Scaffold this active site. Sequence first.
Site, PDB file in Angstrom:
ATOM      1  CD  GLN A   1      16.843   1.319  -1.583  1.00 56.15           C
ATOM      2  OE1 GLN A   1      17.241   2.465  -1.373  1.00 56.15           O
ATOM      3  NE2 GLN A   1      17.488   0.258  -1.146  1.00 56.15           N
TER       4      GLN A   1
ATOM      5  CG  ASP B   1      -0.369   6.442   1.959  1.00 51.70           C
ATOM      6  OD1 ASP B   1      -0.606   5.234   1.750  1.00 51.70           O
ATOM      7  OD2 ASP B   1      -1.068   7.137   2.719  1.00 51.70           O
TER       8      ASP B   1
ATOM      9  CG  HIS C   1      -2.125   0.893   1.033  1.00 52.65           C
ATOM     10  ND1 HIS C   1      -3.261   0.779   1.814  1.00 52.65           N
ATOM     11  CD2 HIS C   1      -2.376   1.891   0.149  1.00 52.65           C
ATOM     12  CE1 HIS C   1      -4.159   1.668   1.417  1.00 52.65           C
ATOM     13  NE2 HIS C   1      -3.650   2.355   0.408  1.00 52.65           N
TER      14      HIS C   1
ATOM     15  CG  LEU D   1      18.492   9.818  -1.628  1.00 51.42           C
ATOM     16  CD1 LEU D   1      19.866  10.037  -2.247  1.00 51.42           C
ATOM     17  CD2 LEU D   1      17.479  10.877  -2.092  1.00 51.42           C
TER      18      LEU D   1
END
Lengths: 168, 168, 169, 168, 168
Positions: C87, C23, C21, C52
């Site tokens: 990532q 955002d 999920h 990053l």
Amino acid sequence: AKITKVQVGEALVGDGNEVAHIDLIIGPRGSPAETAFCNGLVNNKHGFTSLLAVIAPNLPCKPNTLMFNKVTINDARQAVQMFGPAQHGVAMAVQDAVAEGIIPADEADDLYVLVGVFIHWEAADDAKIQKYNYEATKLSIQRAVNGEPKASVVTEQRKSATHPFAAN
Amino acid sequence: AKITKVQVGEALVGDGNEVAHIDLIIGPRGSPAETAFCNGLVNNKHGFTSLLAVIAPNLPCKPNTLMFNKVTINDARQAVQMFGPAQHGVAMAVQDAVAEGIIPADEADDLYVLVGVFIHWEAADDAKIQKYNYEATKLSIQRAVNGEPKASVVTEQRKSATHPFAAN
Amino acid sequence: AKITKVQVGEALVGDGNEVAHIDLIIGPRGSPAETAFCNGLVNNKHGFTSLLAVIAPNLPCKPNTLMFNKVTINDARQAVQMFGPAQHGVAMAVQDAVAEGIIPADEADDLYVLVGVFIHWEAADDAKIQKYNYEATKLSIQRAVNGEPKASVVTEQRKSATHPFAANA
Amino acid sequence: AKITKVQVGEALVGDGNEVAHIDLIIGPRGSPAETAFCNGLVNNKHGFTSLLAVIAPNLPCKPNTLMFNKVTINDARQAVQMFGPAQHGVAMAVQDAVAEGIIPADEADDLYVLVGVFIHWEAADDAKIQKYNYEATKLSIQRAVNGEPKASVVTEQRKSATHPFAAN
Amino acid sequence: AKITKVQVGEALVGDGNEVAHIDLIIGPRGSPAETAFCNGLVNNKHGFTSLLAVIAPNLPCKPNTLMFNKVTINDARQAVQMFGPAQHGVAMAVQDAVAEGIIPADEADDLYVLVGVFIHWEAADDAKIQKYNYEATKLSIQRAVNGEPKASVVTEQRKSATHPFAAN
């Protein structure tokens, strides 16, 4: 004019467990120093509360100054040092800088100072905490106000400086 | 001229437990780098205190540089590594970049650098911590200053890159 | 031109304990997306470190992307999932979006992306974490770039949506 | 446009352990509401994670809404209440406000809403949490959009209000 | 026309364990006071939740006021003191200042107030907490609105002030 933009100052003064190390920022109304001053005051967390530096309750130093600690404050002993000898030291340094013209008197009501304070957890002598922080803060202000050390000056002497904790 | 906006750099250098990985931001006066620099310095929390990078106490590197840790600092050993070999490394990297013209000397007094540093909790060799962070920081600055890697370059080689922790 | 202001995207993709999920926020240089990107990177706390997004070390995705976790990270296992499969998935989604023109190539060097990632503490399959997050991130970007869902669209279908944890409705 | 500046709303609705109390901010693109929305989403801490309000996954409410809790979230039960019945309630309140014209439809894609939500640690009835938060959020939006209560209104009735936790 | 820039106020009133000490900021729409108000409300952490000051639920004071605690809140007793007697005290001080013209009525809908409040962990008398915070907040507002104490005034009396935890 004189202090028309954000300037950063720093200084380590003293020795033993009471050694002071100040990381400081100063800037005028409308600058990021004012923004960080406001954002800083409203945001407290466990072990880190930021407060206005005052010479004494009901007598804050001017320019407005925000103080914040570097070492986690776990008990009242640490809290009182930070906001007792160190606070009085930092606040007197700011006001003495105005009195001596380092911070021009006619700019003092429109400037903001941010002061990061170091107090080792083994610090014990209040007199030294107060004196070393007074001295380190004053040195940081004097430096910041002149934009010192200038980059060219640091470049020139970078190879001869010795960091206490450097691998060497 | 040359560094007129916010640029982001990154680099991983070294191996073993002392491997360095730098996440970095650099930008001029009036930019979000200056705002984050000020908002960052005043906001410390347990396990995460941010400090000015200094070659040595009383000799900060210029441009003004704020250092922050990625790995939670639980004890003095970790604190000293972050603000000893790594700090000296980061600060020297910034000053050597100025000396070498990577960061123009005539821009150094009006720039801000934000450096996130990684130190595995099993790191032990100070010499390597210092060297790898110096190298990673220097590489990150060189990259950031040129806006590298350019998006077109990353797009071209995205399929051949290998993330060590990726599933696939 | 194209992404001229701050846009917000979101998407849930997957199932089981690896469900993703996302955002997300994306915005140009000079916008609050850039400010939050900078303010976010410098501020780490116990259990929450922002980094990053990189396709791999020494190869960050562009536009510059900041990743932050929603679930408290208490150990190395969680940390590696967040900054390993997730990532890589997030970063590839950003780069694939650029390659596919969803994020114009000529805007990629002047945009910032902020990605909040969810990894349940019981997540275990790296392949799924990586895939779901890649999928969710890509969907969020596509939505955000078009300002979708538009308010009129949400208004029209608010009564038929079903929240997994609501009391009802 | 009607909502051209930041407005603040507040409302307490309900009773028992599920009572809702909303502290809310709404503002347009380019305002401090947008800045706090972005700064708020990226900054999560233990016990306090902020998320976009969604009617359901894959269906966020518009205007974009950021939700944050007031009471420390220590377990999954609290987390699901905050981001289940309360989230659905908050999100539906925002969307119903748009549907009803309280938040003009032609402004909904360029506004940001910040919602602080209260859920007592003893709250247990999901239906009530959902309903009270829906009602409190809608009341806060309606008040905020009109800049109510106006200062003159509060001044007039300050002496007759009763704070449940006041000494008197 | 009265309050056109950010002003900082401070005051300590009372004694015993209920002594109040307020660190306050007030500023207009478009100033860093509005930014910090918004950034402050969305950011809660364990032991430190910030809330709108209200005379009572459904009756917030105007100008919009954000309250934040200095002392870590570990239990409900502390939370209720902060958001009961102190909150009512702070909110009434703000509203009375408007009624009395200290904060001009025609400026009240476009100003923001940030109030840091101190409640010692041994505070017990609600009546005193409420009264001291009301008086300290009112004094801080009066001082802030006049930019007092002026730098020249603090400089003149710096040597005669006495700080309770430092002294010199």
